[PDB]
Design an enzyme around this catalytic site. Structure first.
Site, PDB file in Angstrom:
ATOM      1  N   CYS A  32      59.493  59.774  31.183  1.00  0.00           N
ATOM      2  CA  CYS A  32      60.947  59.771  31.124  1.00  0.00           C
ATOM      3  C   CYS A  32      61.357  61.151  30.493  1.00  0.00           C
ATOM      4  CB  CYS A  32      61.373  58.569  30.258  1.00  0.00           C
ATOM      5  SG  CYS A  32      63.116  58.578  29.778  1.00  0.00           S
ATOM      6  N   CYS A  35      63.988  61.060  27.689  1.00  0.00           N
ATOM      7  CA  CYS A  35      63.346  60.485  26.538  1.00  0.00           C
ATOM      8  C   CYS A  35      62.697  61.599  25.677  1.00  0.00           C
ATOM      9  CB  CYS A  35      62.274  59.498  27.002  1.00  0.00           C
ATOM     10  SG  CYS A  35      62.923  57.992  27.798  1.00  0.00           S
TER      11      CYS A  35
END
Length: 105
Positions: A32, A35
């Protein structure tokens, strides 16, 4: 200043040891990008807000926790007080994260 969580018992003990304090949990995965990009800002909040507890949970490390917490979008931020969930949203939104902390602290 982020507690790195590596089991379901470590997770529940952190929630249990927090007392009256807000706990903020960052659910992330290595695939991600956002993230990974918000991670230093997450770290910054834990140095800034020494009165709030910050946890990191990698979903692939901690599949049992991920599944029980009903996580869908990466990253997800869940908020707890006294073991109970008091907030949740997903996405790497810095302004929203901080504002939520200030609402709940």
């Amino acid at each position: 200043m982020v507690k790195q969580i590596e089991s379901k018992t470590a997770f529940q003990e952190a929630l249990d040891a927090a007392g009256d304090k807000l706990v903020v949990v960052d659910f992330s995965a290595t695939w991600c990008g956002p993230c990974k990009m918000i991670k230093p800002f997450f770290h910054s909040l834990s140095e800034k807000y020494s009165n709030v507890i910050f946890l990191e949970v990698d979903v692939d490390d901690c599949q049992d926790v991920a599944s029980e917490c009903e996580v869908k979008c990466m990253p997800t931020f869940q908020f707890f007080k006294k073991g109970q969930k008091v907030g949740e949203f997903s996405g790497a939104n810095k302004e929203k994260l901080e504002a939520t902390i200030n609402e709940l602290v």
